[PDB]
Amino acid sequence: KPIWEQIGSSFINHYYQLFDNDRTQLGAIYIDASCLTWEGQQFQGKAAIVEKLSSLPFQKIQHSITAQDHQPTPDSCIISEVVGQLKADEDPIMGFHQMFLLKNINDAWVCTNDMFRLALHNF
Amino acid sequence: KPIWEQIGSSFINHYYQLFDNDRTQLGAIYIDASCLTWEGQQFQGKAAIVEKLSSLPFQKIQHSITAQDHQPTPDSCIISEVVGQLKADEDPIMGFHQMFLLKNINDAWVCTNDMFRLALHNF
Numbered sequence: 001k002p003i004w005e006q007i008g009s010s011f012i013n014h015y016y017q018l019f020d021n022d023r024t025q026l027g028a029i030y031i032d033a034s035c036l037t038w039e040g041q042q043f044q045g046k047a048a049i050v051e052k053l054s055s056l057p058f059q060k061i062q063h064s065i066t067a068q069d070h071q072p073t074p075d076s077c078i079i080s081e082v083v084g085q086l087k088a089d090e091d092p093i094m095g096f097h098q099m100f101l102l103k104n105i106n107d108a109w110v111c112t113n114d115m116f117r118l119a120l121h122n123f
Numbered sequence: 124k125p126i127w128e129q130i131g132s133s134f135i136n137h138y139y140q141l142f143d144n145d146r147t148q149l150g151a152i153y154i155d156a157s158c159l160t161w162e163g164q165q166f167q168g169k170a171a172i173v174e175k176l177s178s179l180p181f182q183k184i185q186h187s188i189t190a191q192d193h194q195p196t197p198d199s200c201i202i203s204e205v206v207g208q209l210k211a212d213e214d215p216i217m218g219f220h221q222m223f224l225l226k227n228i229n230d231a232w233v234c235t236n237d238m239f240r241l242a243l244h245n246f
Contacts, residue, residue: 069160095246097246
C-alpha cells in the first residue's frame with residue numbers, strides 16, 4: 001500500500017479507537033477550521049465538534065469497518081472513505097458511511113473535514 | 124446558500140448531466156493529478172480515469188440524486204458528498220455513493236479526487 005493508504009488506514013484506526021473508548025478525546029484530531037456534517041447537521045471547530053459527538057446518547061459504541069479507500073490530493077492531503085456498522089448499547093446494528101479529509105499540520109495528521117451518514121434501513 | 128454549497132451543487136449537477144448524456148466529455152472535469160476509485164478499484168491520474176470511464180459496459184445510464192452535502196476546506200477546496208440511485212440499461216436500480224474533492228485550478232472548478240461505490244444500504 002502507498003503511503004497515503006498507510007497514513008489514512010492508521011488515522012481511521014486511531015479515530016474509531018478513540019471514538020469507541022472515549023469520544024471526549026477526539027479533540028486531538030480536529031482543529032478550529034475543522035468542519036463536520038453529521039446526518040446533515042453542521043458544526044465547525046474542535047470544541048463544537050467534540051461537544052456534538054459527546055452529546056450522542058450512548059455509553060458504549062463500537063465501529064466495525066467493512067470497507068475503506070484512500071487517495072492523495074494535490075495539496076498533500078489524504079481523502080478517506082469508510083463504510084461499516086455501528087453498535088451503540090442495545091440499539092439495533094446500524095450501517096454508516098464516513099468521509100475524512102486529512103492534513104498534516106504541526107507534524108500531526110488532523111481531520112479538516114468529516115461527513116457522516118447513517119443507513120436509513122438496516123437488516 | 125453558502126458559496127461552497129452553490130458551487131459544489133452545480134458541479135455535481137454538471138458531472139451527472141455529462142455522465143448520463145455524454146460521458147466522453149467527463150475528462151474535461153479532471154486534471155493530471157486527479158484520482159479515481161471506482162467500486163474499490165483505483166485509477167490514479169487523468170489518463171487511467173479517462174480510459175476506465177470509456178470502458179464502462181453500459182450503453183445508457185441515469186442517476187438520481189437523493190441527498191448531498193458540501194463543505195469548504197482550509198486550502199479553499201470543496202468536498203462534496205452524493206447519495207442517490209442509478210439505473211444502467213436493463214440492470215436493476217442500484218444505490219450509490221460518490222465523493223468529490225473540488226479545486227479551482229487555472230480558474231475552473233475541476234475534480235481532483237473522485238470515489239464512487241455502489242450501495243446496498245440507503246444513506
